Design a protein around this ligand. Structure first.
Ligand SMILES: NC(=O)c1ccc[n+]([C@@H]2O[C@H](COP(=O)([O-])OP(=O)(O)OC[C@H]3O[C@@H](n4cnc5c(N)ncnc54)[C@H](O)[C@@H]3O)[C@@H](O)[C@H]2O)c1
Length: 711
């Protein structure tokens, strides 16, 4: 069905209104391509009676972008048909661009991806200043690239350097004021009522001030020189050139390829180069992994996928944090970012006041960077009130414990506070591994007790792992689910079990690298395989952040938990490496020494005496084997959480692995890595199963795939 209504006044200015009936948002589906074709074909058939075009929308947004439902189904053999589709898109925008008549975009809200590309094919872009309006080309975050002329036009507008670093490489979303300054928007208006009138007025004015250049883009005139001069030069871009190697993620380098190759030719050939690289990424497996995680899975979580279905909102009044530390003091800051009053408690009043001081050091740094205002700085600190008296906790309807990880201590910390807080107060616990059901026995109201696991530093980490105990009510689960969306963080819901999900899966990752070291692998190759696999932090570097002595008793609870069941326990080969590192007095960053040497709180080089300790060099496995040993460990462990019921959806698994433990984004998550694996022996789950058995026959039975993956 049609998606664009045709409006023409007496002056001769046609108004194309993009009103897609099949949804609330205009999106580059097959229906739009049908409409824009017949709408651009009419502007050429009535060329003699039209003196200008206006492109508007009838939604709260302008245009949302490409049809991700169809792009994620694009098989590699569809590469040729995909090339023809985007060519048809750009041919319509190129004809509209060269009518010889002015064309103005009346941007009335969000204009993303395909939407900004439509507006870039215009000669003038008027945008409103409405709260929530965003503009940009964010398809790089999905492993794609601006294929509707976004790459070709932005390079012609700002040159290779500016267009790539600002808009294309990172897919930055802009507010209309920031979009006008960089050159993405030519004029601003107050409200949407005056968007269309200001467009026709600008057309009337341009038709007499620039009667020859009207409708002629700056890069179609005779003497055109691209800004920055026409053209592998990865030295001028910023220090974020780790994405330009294109090794795990091919999208950033492919964009730079289409840009640099498109600057040496004319506009029409530059466009076709853009189309060739677009069909290359779209039909790839990396783009499907990213389309799955950072579009489908994210929206499913922010739409309440894990949240219980029939619970309403319970507004929060006052919050209480039991224990101010690296997490407790950070918990107070993120909560005080919103209008939530925060009461902080610790052992002594100075220990509670010290926790607030750390929250003030972040605001002082933000003032030096001009992030917010001074009146907003004093108002934020006016919501944090540290104390050592429990009477201040009276009136708190949301408790977040963050004391020392001690079971009999947390039963005492709540025993002091459960009678003084509100009868409907949430008894939230922030524990790394202690079972929630074993912690709720210390409070009277077990139905309101719940686990709320943050990640340090709290101000930076966007994930909150909500752990549900056996007694936890679904209403308290929803009240925490809403609190997470209020602090700007993403929630996942986990059933109570030893290791939860985020610490259990990251354990198999750090235990795999420590295993190789005990087997006799060069410590440089372990960090190389980690970096090449796409982990933001190499595993030995991550093993010094998490304390080794903290990881010691993690291996003591598991051993005695299997022996209590009357069975023989099988130790992980990494356990011997930990005990060896503990014998040598190197326990991690906190102690000041670990796999890396540390000085003044910074990370120096790897420990020189490490190679002699583990006879490094005796084991030299293939680099892909090392890469796949760490990835398959997390993917198999994630699968066993879905079997045991620790997780209830792959979307939580995928988003949990990415935003929580640093799983490589190109995999799309630890669950997606099973259905999206690709090796020299195939793609998909069967190929994942075959590769798993290959690693198993060589290294150990821990790589054997569970039954749920077989048939
Ligand atoms: N530290 C992390 O990065 C991290 C990450 C994930 C989970 N966790 C877990 O969540 C919690 C986070 O604590 P942390 O590591 O940020 O803090 P920390 O261990 O550095 O300090 C804990 C604080 O609790 C205070 N405290 C002790 N007894 C108290 C009492 N009776 N009442 C009130 N306060 C008391 C201490 O004085 C101290 O300020 C711990 O349970 C931890 O195991 C920690």
């Amino acid at each position: 069905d049609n998606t664009i209504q045709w409006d023409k006044d007496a002056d001769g200015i046609v108004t194309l209104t993009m009103d897609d009936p099949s949804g609330s948002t205009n999106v580059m589906n097959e229906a739009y391509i049908e409409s824009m074709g017949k709408a651009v074909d009419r502007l050429v058939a009535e060329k003699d009676s039209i003196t200008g075009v206006v492109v508007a929308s009838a939604k709260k947004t302008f245009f949302a972008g490409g049809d991700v439902k169809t792009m994620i189904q694009a098989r590699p053999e569809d590469a040729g048909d995909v090339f023809n589709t985007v060519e048809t898109i750009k041919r319509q925008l190129r004809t509209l661009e060269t009518l010889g008549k002015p064309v103005v975009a009346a941007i009335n809200g969000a204009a993303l991806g395909g939407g900004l590309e439509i507006a870039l094919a215009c000669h003038h872009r008027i945008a409103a200043d409405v709260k929530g309006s965003q503009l940009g080309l964010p398809e790089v975050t999905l492993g794609l690239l601006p294929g509707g002329g976004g790459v070709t036009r932005t390079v012609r507008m700002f040159g290779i350097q500016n267009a790539f670093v600002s808009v294309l490489a990172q897919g930055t979303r802009f507010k209309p004021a920031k979009a006008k300054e960089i050159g993405l928007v030519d004029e601003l208006v107050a409200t949407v009522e005056e968007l269309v009138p200001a467009a026709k007025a600008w057309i009337k004015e341009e038709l007499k001030a620039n009667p020859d250049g009207a409708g002629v883009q700056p890069w179609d005139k005779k003497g055109y020189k691209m800004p920055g001069g026409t053209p592998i030069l990865p030295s001028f871009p910023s220090n974020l050139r780790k994405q330009l190697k294109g090794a795990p993620m091919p999208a950033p380098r492919a964009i730079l390829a289409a840009a640099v190759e498109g600057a040496q030719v004319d506009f029409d050939t530059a466009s076709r180069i853009e189309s060739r690289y677009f069909a290359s990424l779209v039909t790839g497996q990396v783009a499907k992994n990213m389309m799955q995680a950072f579009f489908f899975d994210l929206q499913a979580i922010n739409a309440g996928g894990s949240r219980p279905e029939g619970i309403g909102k319970t507004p929060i009044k006052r919050i209480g944090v039991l224990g101010a530390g690296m997490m407790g003091a950070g918990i107070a800051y993120v909560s005080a970012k919103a209008g939530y009053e925060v009461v902080l408690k610790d052992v002594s009043l100075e220990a509670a006041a010290k926790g607030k001081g750390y929250s003030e050091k972040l605001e002082a740094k933000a003032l030096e960077r001009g992030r917010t205002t001074q009146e907003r700085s004093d108002a934020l600190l006016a919501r944090i009130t540290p104390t050592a008296d429990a009477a201040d906790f009276k009136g708190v309807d949301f408790v977040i414990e963050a004391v020392f990880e001690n079971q009999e201590l947390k039963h005492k910390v709540f025993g002091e506070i459960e009678d003084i807080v509100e009868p409907n107060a949430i008894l939230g616990s922030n524990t790394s591994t202690l079972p929630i059901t074993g912690l709720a026995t210390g409070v009277k109201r077990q139905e309101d007790f719940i686990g709320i696991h943050f990640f340090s530093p709290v101000d930076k980490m966007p994930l909150v792992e909500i752990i549900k105990g056996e007694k936890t009510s679904d209403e308290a689960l929803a009240r925490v689910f809403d609190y997470t969306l209020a602090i700007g963080k993403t929630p996942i819901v986990v059933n109570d079990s030893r290791g939860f999900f985020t610490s259990r899966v990251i354990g198999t990752f750090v235990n795999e690298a420590l295993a190789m070291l005990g087997e006799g692998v060069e410590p440089a190759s372990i960090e190389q395989a980690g970096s090449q696999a796409g982990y933001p932090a190499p595993p030995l570097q991550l093993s010094d952040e998490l304390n080794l002595e903290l990881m010691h008793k993690i291996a003591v609870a598991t051993r005695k938990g299997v022996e209590d069941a009357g069975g023989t326990y099988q130790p992980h080969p990494a356990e011997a490496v930990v005990e060896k590192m503990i014998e040598l007095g190197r326990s991690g960053r906190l102690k000041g020494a670990g796999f890396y040497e540390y000085a003044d709180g910074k990370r120096s080089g790897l420990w020189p005496g490490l190679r002699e300790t583990f006879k490094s060099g005796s084991s030299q496995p293939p680099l892909q084997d090392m890469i796949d040993r760490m990835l398959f460990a997390e993917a198999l462990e994630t699968q066993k959480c879905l079997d045991e019921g620790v997780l209830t959806s792959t979307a939580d698994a995928n988003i949990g692995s990415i935003m929580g433990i640093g799983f490589p984004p190109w995999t799309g998550g630890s669950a997606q890595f099973i259905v999206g694996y690709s090796g020299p022996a195939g793609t998909g789950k069967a190929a994942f199963v075959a590769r798993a058995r290959e690693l198993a026959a060589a290294y150990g039975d821990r790589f054997l795939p569970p039954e749920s993956l077989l048939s």
